[PDB]
Structure formats: structure tokens, C-alpha cells
Design a protein around this nucleic acid. Structure first.
Lengths: 241, 246, 246
DNA sequence: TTTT
DNA sequence: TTTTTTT
DNA sequence: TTTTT
């Protein structure tokens, strides 16, 4: 029995030797969060929301080459290392904190109505919890779930994305929506997180806003615009609209 | 500011408030007007072959960067430009090209004969008598949201979209692979975006197509299980007790 | 007129006014590179299967090179891919079940693999062990190797039927598409299922029928199975109820 | 607006 | 519903 | 514990 590594896999396939892989250190993002979060709080709240909006756009440019910003620069990742998903996740955790201040919250909610991911969910933007979910959308749920009080909002969003992946236009091949939820629970069990009635009810408040979201708007305002004519064709075919 | 690497380093390193912009506004009708001439250089028999072998042809194109003539599919990733050529954009051009040829008697006759053996055809039990019926056949399997933006193709798109929506069970359409409500929903967005109005002429035109669809004899399945294989496959489903055959 | 479907033929289809038609091997790939994999230990092979998913991520980490062979992660017909490696090893392992002593080693070791026991597959004879080697493999690839046709397509059907019981996610693995691809392979080699091949298939199907399938998602999701299911049903149909006070 |  | 990181 | 819509 040998530790599962990259150099062992090349030897597995090239040698007549009998090899097995131990399976059975430890990275904590919450601990990582406590460190680098102070550094991201020096970012402007506006600079953070631009990051969320251009996430995929910013990502492609960063992946062009070794990307260096300040003293940190973004294939086995060390526990102190900064990753794009880790940068994204810090920025999201940071922003949720600002939803406790009314002045920042108004700017966030208003600007947060203009995200590409937002409106696609058709998520209602009413209270602070409504804003936090918007900040949550598109983030690395396995990472963020490890931060305290972020456990339920993470696993709740994970299930909704798993359930409604079609409506949300989520390609299961591009994004494994089951695996994501599977990973979240792995993280919660590592912190021995237990889901009590308070956490579950807290989750249900989160869950409510997600049910009230409307994943497809444009396609449902044009259909009703032509519904008089559309329904006349429905009727000729089997069933009556 | 324009999105660059130096603006991103300033986003993360400065207490300054920064902004940048994302996707490309695309209009298939314009794309069609441009690239349709390049597709007119294909043989009509070659076009129907493309349609008949759609899935097979796609996979080969998707193996690598595919270049033909001036056109290149550029494989995938980095999103898609409004000027760029895609497989679906290619497929839809070929269908649009074919539908125009239905104004010609000799061409109408060759297509009608050649397209009668396609797998998607026969699955609909579509009768091929007149020109309008043949257009519907060319239409089958095509990207209705793309083709609908092209002039005069609005009604045939939305009527077929609704029919697929009503008869999606009879047609053996998997709701997970193809959301038949979403598809109709996209077509109307396209029609509404060009301010298409359904007057009595268009509605009357729509009904001419719809008539052809009621008279059609829709058939589920029509997959790649041989007439030699259907008999043996279902014995095993029954062995697992999961066959509905009788 | 009728031509083989290739990349140069598709360019000729689109760029030439000539009339072209089509009208429709890994086995060859198998005969070549399998000898490279035969130097592996049978135990090393079973380690590969057991640790399939984990090893894959390490391989997908970068361009993976072992011996003369390298996995990039475009693909040549001769290039080696992860699935091609996995399928080679599974074919290799099936050959070794023709030897009684090796059959014991495989039977003993593979009895502890996660996919087995999830199937609740009983391990008695050689044919039972082959099905065990078969689990999780690429059915369309392995189907192209001779004499692997029936075990491939029978297992493909069992999975299409029992995907619910096996805890198989239709989103991650299209259980119909897989079956569809296997038959496509059989038709491409013009495979015929006579009474004997079906009799052979029925022998396999029997063993899968005698199996008792029990699957649960990973380790942690089963630990949280009681609380998790409560959340799925709240996102069922459509509901917008808010909860106000006065 | 994509290997539907 | 052959080629891919498809439980 | 990664460029996962």
C-alpha cells in the first residue's frame, strides 16, 4: 500500500510490480478566510461587485499567464496558496459582511440587480438575506461552506441548483451539480456540523427566496404576448391551452 | 475601463472603486445574409446528406478545429463571436438554404424523395405532398430559435415549436435533453425582438402548416435500435421487468 | 457518390458542388496498445479500477506521460486517452478470467470495490466476475472489441432499467445515450444477435438479475440523508408564499 | 447566441 | 446517440 | 483543497 500520488500512477502502469493505494494533510478554508479576509477588506465594496459581475471575464484573462496582483500571484495547491476560486470566495464572504451596514447594502442590492447571473435566476432583491444569496450565486460552494454561519446558505443553494439546474440553464457536463452538493456535505462533516431546527429554519428562509425566483423571464413575456395566437394553435393540436 | 490584466491588478490592489463593462449581441438574420452564399456552393444532395448525418458529422467536426473554405468552426471556448461560425449556425444555414430551393419543381422533387428516408422524418409520420410540408421536414431537428429570425420563417418555426410542445411525449422527446417549453419560449423572444406581428395572413399561413402536423402520424423512439435489435433488447428489459412492449 | 464519413470528406461536402452521400476502430487500437498494458500486474490493474476516479483527477491535472504514451487533456486516432486506458485495462482483466487462478485473485480483490456491493453483485463463476470488471467502464469502446458485444449491451440495458435503484444520476450519465452508442458500434461492425449470442446474453442477464442493488451517494451525503431529503421537496413545483406579520 |  | 475528466 | 451556469 502506497500513498496515491502522481509519480506512483506512472509506475503503476509501467511496472509489473503489485501496487495499492492507501486512500483513507488537511486544508481549512475558514482558517484561510480568517487570514486573507483582512487583506480583501482593503478592497472597495464596489471593486468587489465588479469582480462578481466579470467573474468569468476576469477569469479568462488571469488564466492567460501567471497572474500577479500585489504580493500574491495565482499543480497541487498549498493550504496558504491563493486560488481563483479562493479569491472569488473571499470576496463573496467579505461582501456578505457588508450587508449588515445599510449604506453599503443599498449600493450592493442596486448594483447587484445588474449581474448576468442575477435576473437569470430572477431572484427577488428585497431584504439583506435576498442580497446575500445574490452574492452567493456562482461561488465555490465547497469552499464557502466551511466558513461559520455559511453552512446552511451553502448547502441550501447547492440543492436548489441541483434541483432546478435545467431551469437555471446549468449544463450538468460543464457543472456537476450533484458533486457540488456531495462536496458540501463532506466539508460539513469535517467540522462536525449538525443541522438543528434553528439552522434548518434559517435555511428555509433562504429556500423561500429561491422558490420565488423566476429563472426564465423573457421567454415568458413573449409567449404571453402572442398567447392569443399561440393558444389557437395549441387547440388544433392535442390538448387545449 | 476596458478589461485588461493591468486593470485587474488595480481592482484587487487599490481602495479605488473600479468598473469594466460582457457577451456578444447576435442576430442570426444578419449572419444568414452574409454566410448563405458560401453554403449555396454545396450540392443539394450534399445538403440533405448533411441533414441526414447531422449527429455523426458534428462529432467529427468537434474532434478538432474544423476548417472548410473561408469558414472555420474554431472548435470551442472563448465564448462565441457574433461573426463566428458555429455548428448549429452552419446547420441552420443549410436548412434555410434548402427551404428556398422548394420554390423550384425539380429541386422540390429530389429533396422530397431523398428526405423521405431520414430518421427524424417518419418519426413524425409527416406526409410529403406539397412544398409547405417539405419545408417542415427540412425544419425538423433544426434550431428553431436561430432560424426564426430569418424573414418569413417566423410562423413555420413557432408552429413547429408549439407542435413539438404539445406532442413531445408522442415524439419521444426527453424533457431533460430538450425543454420543449423553453424552446417555444426562445422562438417568441426572437419574434418579439424583430417586432413580428401575427396578422390574418400570417395566422392563416401558420394554419396551413398546422394542418399538415395534425395529419402527421407521430411516433416515439426512432432511435438506433435495429429492427433486428428491438426484439432482443426488450426481452432483457422484461428479464429485468422494465419493458412496456406488448 | 457514396463515400466514407471522414474529416476531408466533410470539407469536400461543404466546399464542392459535387453530390456526395455516406450511408453507414478501437478494436484495432486495442490490438496495438494492449500489449503495453499487459506488463502491468493484475493487482496493479485492480488498483486502477478501484481508484479510477481519484487517479483520473491526478491524470487530468496536467499532460500525463507514462512510457512512450502521453495523455494531453485534439485527439489522434492513435493518441491515448484516459477512457482508452481504462477500457484497455478492463479488457485485459477479462482475458485473465480465462485462467482459473487469476480468476480467484480478481474475484477476491474486486469483491471489495465500491461499485460492486453497490450492485450487490454475487461473485461465483467466471461470467459473474467479468460483469464485475465491466462496471463503470466505457461500454461503447469495449463493445468494439470482439466477443465483448453481448456483455456490453446487456449490462447497458440493465443500467438503463435499474439506474434509479443503482443511484445513477441521469445528468452525469445518460443511461439511454450509452445504450444507443453501443448498438451503433454493433451496427457499424454489422453485429448480428442470433439465438446463441442472445443465449449467451441471457446467461449474463441472469446474474445481474440475481444481484441485489443498493447504492448511496458518497460517504457524507448518506450521513446527512435524513435532513437533506427534506429540502428537495420544498423546491418541487412552484411556490412564492411570503410570511408577513400584520 | 453552445456537441439539444 | 463509435473517439471526452459519463456513478 | 482546480478556468465547475
Amino acid at each position: 500500500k502506497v500513498k496515491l500520488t502522481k509519480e506512483n500512477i506512472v509506475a503503476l502502469l509501467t511496472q509489473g510490480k503489485d501496487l495499492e493505494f492507501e486512500e483513507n494533510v488537511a486544508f481549512n478554508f475558514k482558517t484561510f478566510c480568517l487570514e486573507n479576509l483582512d487583506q480583501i477588506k482593503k478592497m472597495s465594496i464596489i471593486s468587489c461587485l465588479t469582480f462578481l459581475k466579470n467573474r468569468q471575464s476576469i477569469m479568462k484573462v488571469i488564466k492567460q499567464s501567471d497572474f500577479t496582483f500585489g504580493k500574491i500571484t495565482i499543480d497541487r495547491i498549498g493550504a496558504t496558496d491563493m486560488t481563483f476560486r479562493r479569491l472569488d470566495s473571499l470576496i463573496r464572504v467579505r461582501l456578505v459582511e457588508e450587508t449588515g451596514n445599510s449604506e453599503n447594502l443599498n449600493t450592493i442590492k442596486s448594483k447587484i440587480a445588474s449581474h448576468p447571473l442575477i435576473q437569470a435566476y430572477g431572484l427577488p432583491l428585497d431584504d439583506a438575506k435576498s442580497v446575500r444569496l445574490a452574492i452567493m450565486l456562482g461561488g465555490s460552494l465547497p469552499l464557502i461552506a466551511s466558513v461559520d454561519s455559511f453552512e446552511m446558505i451553502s448547502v441550501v443553494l447547492a440543492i436548489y441548483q441541483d434541483a432546478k439546474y435545467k431551469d437555471l440553464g446549468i449544463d450538468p457536463k460543464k457543472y456537476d451539480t450533484k458533486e457540488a452538493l456531495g462536496k458540501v456535505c463532506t466539508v460539513l462533516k469535517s467540522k462536525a456540523f449538525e443541522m438543528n431546527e434553528d439552522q434548518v429554519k434559517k435555511g428555509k428562509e433562504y429556500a423561500a427566496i429561491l422558490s420565488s425566483s423566476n429563472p426564465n423571464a423573457k421567454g415568458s413575456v413573449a409567449m404571453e404576448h402572442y398567447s392569443e395566437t399561440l393558444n389557437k394553435f395549441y387547440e388544433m393540436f392535442g390538448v387545449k391551452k
